[PDB]
């Protein structure tokens with residue numbers, strides 16, 4: 001009528017600007033900063049390229065013809081615009097699947113999913129996504145043609161239309177898209193983000209706690225006391241000799257290590273350490289009573305201490321050990337910070353003490369809080385993707401099954417806005433990235 005074209009020009013041109021500006025920004029930032037190019041962002045970089053492709057090679061050749069009600073570009077543009085639209089949706093859907101699968105590797109199988117975290121594999125997947133997406137979509141250029149129709153005053157026009165040899169094939173193709181663009185990617189990412197979510201809920205434990213407090217040094221080093229240490233805080237000898245640490249090292253890893261161990265030997269060593277700390281708590285007649293009275297989070301604070309100072313040194317925390325057993329957490333927290341231990345390693349001690357005072361992991365939660373944030377962003381991106389793409393795919397499927405119904409309900413402004421919703425998905429992720437560093 002009179003307004004509809006105005007709102008269309010408005011919304012289309014706005015969504016074009018945001019999507020062009022938004023995605024080229026995301027690309028130029030990522031191309032600029034080598035520090036930014038993580039595995040997850042290399043995918044979000046392949047995602048932002050498909051969003052740019054959809055935005056420049058399809059959107060004008062949809063608003064302009066839908067605004068004029070006449071596809072006035074060539075038969076080639078008609079095959080091109082349909083080709084890139086389906087290629088884009090495919091690349092995007094399988095980029096989102098790759099992301100869910102790499103975060104699953106990182107969060108759920110960290111020391112077990114080593115290759116899924118190589119940038120070389122990441123660019124292998126990205127290449128296989130674009131190549132296969134152009135391949136399975138070749139029906140669109142093969143079977144899309146100008147379809148002549150006639151307007152008001154018997155005025156010939158064309159519409160760009162995708163027509164397969166019959167109805168069984170038109171309907172088979174939509175079953176196809178249903179499967180490899182929604183069902184199969186949908187469950188893959190729902191199982192994945194579901195497992196990721198389970199893990200992230202179970203939260204911090206003694207191992208993650210000691211990994212934050214100790215770190216990883218592959219080569220022999222000295223701690224705050226000046227003692228020779230390796231791996232994840234593994235004390236080698238109190239003696240000042242370096243020859244003796246190197247000896248106690250080779251004996252513990254079983255090979256002539258030459259001062260240097262692997263990450264895999266550090267974790268094996270570190271697992272024996274947490275084992276040994278916990279056995280020392282159980283075998284010591286002063287520590288075991290306190291331990292049993294402790295809740296699992298505080299148990300881990302007691303283990304944290306015993307891991308740093310040994311069974312016997314901690315068992316001599318007689319006045320703090322008593323307060324803990326009596327559930328006097330504030331008293332214990334105040335007393336423990338008057339100790340020499342506090343004075344030697346304040347930052348670590350302040351955390352362990354916070355754990356004792358509150359019974360929570362707040363002291364160690366920062367990193368977990370970051371992973372949870374990213375994961376919730378990714379689940380939001382996936383849900384806004386499907387919500388932006390279900391309508392147009394459902395309108396094409398309904399056309400292939402009952403074209404007369406589909407066209408009478410959707411032909412005017414509804415499919416105009418349904419198409420608009422599609423392009424909106426390509427300007428969604430940059431806006432999300434903006435609201436993420438708030």
Ligand SMILES: CN1C(=O)[C@@H](NC(=O)c2cc3ccccc3[nH]2)N=C(c2ccccc2)c2ccccc21
Nearest residue numbers: 081082085086160161162395399406407410411415
């Ligand atoms: C030719 N082509 C369509 O026919 C359009 N479907 C409609 O426009 C439409 C559906 C419908 C239902 C009821 C009534 C009226 C209807 N119109 N489908 C997309 C597309 C979507 C996903 C993958 C590939 C192509 C597309 C995108 C850009 C250019 C051409 C193009």
